[PDB]
Task: structure prediction
Amino acid sequence: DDHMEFCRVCKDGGELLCCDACPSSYHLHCLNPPLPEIPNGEWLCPRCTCPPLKGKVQRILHWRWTEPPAPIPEREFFVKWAGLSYWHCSWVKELQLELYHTVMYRNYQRKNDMDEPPPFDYGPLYAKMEERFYRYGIKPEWMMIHRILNHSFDKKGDVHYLIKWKDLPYDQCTWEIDDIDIPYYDNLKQAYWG
Ligand SMILES: [Zn+2]
Ligand SMILES: [Zn+2]
Result:
């Protein structure tokens, strides 16, 4: 059960600080934020400290820069979650992706530039729907309801509906929450029940 004899971030050896939960080892200048020096007691590495993901990510859409944590800028990615529709597209931390979706993460890496974010895809509440969604690569039909196919009740009992989304094949239907203001949503709910 040895540790890495080289900093994970910079691949070089020397003064190393080793995680007590995993064999990772880092150079204090390499971590973000950098640490003053060797801390007292246990120390868990940035990949051991990393929080788990809310679900499983289906597709990475976009990435952005963010403000450095409080003592180098980190990075967040706009993700499409597997099983949930584009209304649930969230932002996740770069190291979350590498830890839990490595091959997918590195596949994205190989294709694009990771110094400058990709350009926005421009081709009522549209001006905002363009803000959270459309510019990142979400074709606006993918957030429009085509059909309500079925309903379901969970442990708590909040009803879920299985929605077929427009210009998105049935294989990517999605169980959606009751309390979300989709355009038209409750009008199709009444059609389904009535
Ligand atoms: Zn660790
Ligand atoms: Zn290093």
Q: What stands out?
A: The domain at 140-193 is CATH 2.40.50.40 (OB fold (Dihydrolipoamide Acetyltransferase, E2P)). The CA atoms of residues 94 and 142 lie 25 Å apart. The pocket of zinc ion (ligand 2) is lined by residues 7, 9-10, 12, 27, 30 (CB under 6 Å). Helices lie at 46-49, 94-100, 102-111, 126-132, 185-193.
